[PDB]
Please model this.
Amino acid sequence: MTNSNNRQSEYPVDPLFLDRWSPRAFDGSPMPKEHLLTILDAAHWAPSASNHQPWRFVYAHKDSEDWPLFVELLMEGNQKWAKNASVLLFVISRDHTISHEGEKKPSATHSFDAGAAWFSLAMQAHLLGYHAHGMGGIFKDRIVEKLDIPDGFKVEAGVAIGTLTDKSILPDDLAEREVPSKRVPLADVAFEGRFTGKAD
Amino acid sequence: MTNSNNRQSEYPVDPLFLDRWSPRAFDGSPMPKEHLLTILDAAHWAPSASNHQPWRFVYAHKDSEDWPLFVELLMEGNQKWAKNASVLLFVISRDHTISHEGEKKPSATHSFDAGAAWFSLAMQAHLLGYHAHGMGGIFKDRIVEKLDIPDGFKVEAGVAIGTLTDKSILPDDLAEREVPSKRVPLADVAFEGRFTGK
Ligand SMILES: Cc1cc2nc3c(=O)[nH]c(=O)nc-3n(C[C@H](O)[C@H](O)[C@H](O)COP(=O)(O)O)c2cc1C
Ligand SMILES: Cc1cc2nc3c(=O)[nH]c(=O)nc-3n(C[C@H](O)[C@H](O)[C@H](O)COP(=O)(O)O)c2cc1C
Model:
């Protein structure tokens, strides 16, 4: 198996899958504009049903006139550490398809497909030497109103991206959590032939 | 800017993001059991809200007693080509959690998180020299029934995984589509400061 990033996999996974993680101690430095565009470019190369590409990204750099708005759209707990990230953005998805004639049909996969784009985002960030950190502790209705998100678009998650620094900058409770998370055994989620896992 | 796999990126992305794609011409060869486990192990390392890990994967190898069933759970247009993949599986997500005291709570991010696991699956497949192909043209209610999926678990997608072969094996309409797909300009989906698209 693989040993990497204080994690051990049961099978020889690429170390990239263990090395990608979501810390909270960010150094508050500026990220080059092209680096963020590369990250979002990788994200937008994700697969999606019918190649509909339902994801959207609304982003702000730490030097933005709207940085404080992006910070205050997160819940207080997340603000405490995410305010020191280099970039904040929201991952959004179109919850329908719309035709040339403006006819709307509910999308069965838009959130799923947005998640693929988000992993791609996190992976590209990782590859450039950054860490991305997903957030659901966010004010979704305020995001929609303040960021002019049109009807039929869903806020999936916030994302903080930055350069990792020493945990000492964190309050003690977060510093204690600054360690890569573990996973359940593969056999608890991967079943041959039929669903053999417990329902709970 | 990056050029790879008959695709061109606007920004210098890792060529892995361009090289990963979803062909339909598969060679029907057996995939080693450990290779599929490595793929799903990568998938299960995805991030998820609260580290709930809501994904499940139900899989069969082409050599399987279950293969005919797995093939028949795909719509006909998918069967035509996916029946020649090495592995077929369904990505499933748990739509809820339950407290110590028994209170069921809907999960807001379970499909989104499953999607992250699916990209991870597809990327690890790619890195081992295979190709994964996602499928929504599937019989979900029949999948739930036949594969004994419990209540509160959602079928997200089918996935075919295998080893690419010459497109000549495909019917013409699919042969024409056996090329790496394109994307909208980045600026059409990435907006600074405010949502400005459409
Ligand atoms: C959609 C989603 C929402 C998340 N929301 C939060 C959050 O609001 N606050 C937080 O500290 N972490 C949040 N996370 C981080 C997860 O807890 C983390 O990704 C998970 O524990 C796995 O750890 P890893 O990403 O380091 O592998 C979220 C992750 C996902 C993908
Ligand atoms: C959830 C989803 C559902 C899909 N359903 C089908 C389908 O049923 N039939 C098919 O041939 N391809 C299907 N695909 C393939 C997509 O059309 C394909 O991933 C997209 O055009 C982008 O191409 P790429 O993955 O080669 O980069 C599906 C993909 C996604 C992720």
About this structure: Residues 4 and 18 of chain B are 6 Å apart (CA to CA).
